[PDB]
Amino acid sequence: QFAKPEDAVKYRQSALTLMASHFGRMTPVVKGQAPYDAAQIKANVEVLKTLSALPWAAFGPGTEGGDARPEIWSDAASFKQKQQAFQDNIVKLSAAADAGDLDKLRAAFGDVGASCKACHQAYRK
Amino acid sequence: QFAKPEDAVKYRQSALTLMASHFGRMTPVVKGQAPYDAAQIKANVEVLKTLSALPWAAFGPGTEGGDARPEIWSDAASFKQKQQAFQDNIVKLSAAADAGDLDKLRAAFGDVGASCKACHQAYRK
Ligand code: HEC
Ligand code: HEC
């Protein structure tokens, strides 16, 4: 859907920005600094699950650019594993949110964050 | 969810970028320049419906900035009407996509685009 590689870069940066807001806005909740409303979090995690499926299709071959490392492309199977593993961490977060289980939410949130940090150290300049 | 007004600006710009890609990538399909796969479009419009609910909460009071006109805030009921009417145009697009009805898709797509253009002329610098 991208006329030029720059358009893919702009898309994925935007998707990642949104994905980061939907994740990070729950930090006060997980820490107990903000109240836990199970319905609120269930709805937010549904938004996060949609967003978390979006960036990866905008790292197609030849879309080198932005803050992305060139290792994203040469090691296609491995980058894929990190994005697929991140989404299966998101599936666990959804399950926790759907259950309205704060303790399960906190644990799943920590796992998701670790997956963010890993892919970052690895595939972000 | 925004530490400073700039963070709201960045969020809404990103949401609007995503929303624009999910809408505009269907243009070749509506024009017949690309094939119509009803399942593909149904899934894409589901993504667009999620995205189309996101920008508006990032125009909260005091988040003046970006390319947004100051009329977004002083006329809160009217801006609201344009975003609510845009989303009800998206509901009609979803219905068309869910029905797998190309003619209904084209008509709904045109209505959505007109709603984009209107709010733009009005509330974008
Ligand atoms: C790889 C499988 C990643 C996972 C999982 C996550 N991110 Fe990441 N992120 C990744 C790359 C390769 C890039 C650079 C994209 C580019 O072309 O520039 C990024 C970027 C971000 C950004 C900055 C976006 C921008 O506006 O430019 C943020 C804020 C970000 N990523 C956050 C983030 C969070 C919180 C994640 C988990 C919820 C996460 N990312 C996962 C690669 C990957
Ligand atoms: C008001 C109710 C709007 C509707 C409906 C749509 N858009 Fe819009 N858009 C609007 C504003 C006020 C702004 C400026 C935001 C800012 O603070 O800068 C925008 C911006 C865009 C952008 C640019 C985003 C960026 O990266 O900076 C695009 C590409 C865009 N809008 C597209 C667009 C499309 C295609 C729409 C319908 C599917 C649409 N917008 C609706 C206000 C409103």
**Crossing angle of helices A76-99/A38-52, nearest 10°?**
160
Distance A56 CA to ligand 1 centre (A): 10
**DSSP letter at A33?**
S
Name residues whose C-beta falls within 8 Å of residue A116's C-beta, 6 or more positions apart in sequence.
Answer: A20, A23, A86
Closest CA to B47 of A2, A16, A46: A46
Structurally, chain B folds into a number of domains equal to 1
Find residue B113's DSSP bridge partners: none
| Contact assignment for A17 to B11 by CB distance below 8 Å | yes
| CA–CA distance, A106 with A36 (Å, rounded to integer) | 11
Residues forming a β-bridge with A68: A124
The string of DSSP codes covering A7-28 is: HHHHHHHHHHHHHHHHHHTTHH
After what residues is chain B interrupted, C–N > 2.5 A?
none
Q: Name the residue of B4, B16, B84 to mutate for ligand 2: max ligand atoms within 8 A of Cβ.
A: B16
Residue B84 φ/ψ, nearest 5 degrees = -65, -40
What range does the domain containing A123 cover? 2-125
Q: Taking the CB of residue B9, how many other CB atoms lie within 10 A of it? A: 19
Minimum CA–CA partner of A16 in chain B? B14
The residue of B21, B41, B51, B63 whose CB has the most chain A CBs within 10 angstroms, and thus the best one to mutate to test that interface, is B21
Structure solved via: X-ray
Q: How many other CB atoms are found less than 10 A from the CB of residue A124?
A: 12
Residue B55 has which token pair? 């920008």
**Closest by CA position to A37, among listed A97, A89, A95, A93:** A97
Residues A3-22: b if buried by 16+ CB within 10 A, e if exposed: eebeebbbbbbbbbbbbebb
Q: Which residues of B touch A15 (CB under 8 A)?
A: 14, 18
Exposure pattern of A70-97 as b/e (b: 16+ CB <10 Å)? eebbeeeeebeebbeebeebbebbbebb
CATH code of the domain in which A43 resides: 1.20.120.10
Resolution of the experimental model, in Å, one decimal: 1.1
Whole-number Å distance, alpha carbon A120 to ligand 1 midpoint, is 6
Which ligand is in closest contact with the Cα of B81?
2
Ligand 1 pocket by Cβ (under 6 Å): A 9, 12-13, 16-17, 19-20, 23, 66-68, 82-83, 86, 112, 115-116, 119-120, 123-124
Question: Residue B26 and residue B34: Cα distance in Å, rounded?
Answer: 9
Instruction: Give the closest residue to A89 by CA, choosing from A68, A104, A67.
Output: A104
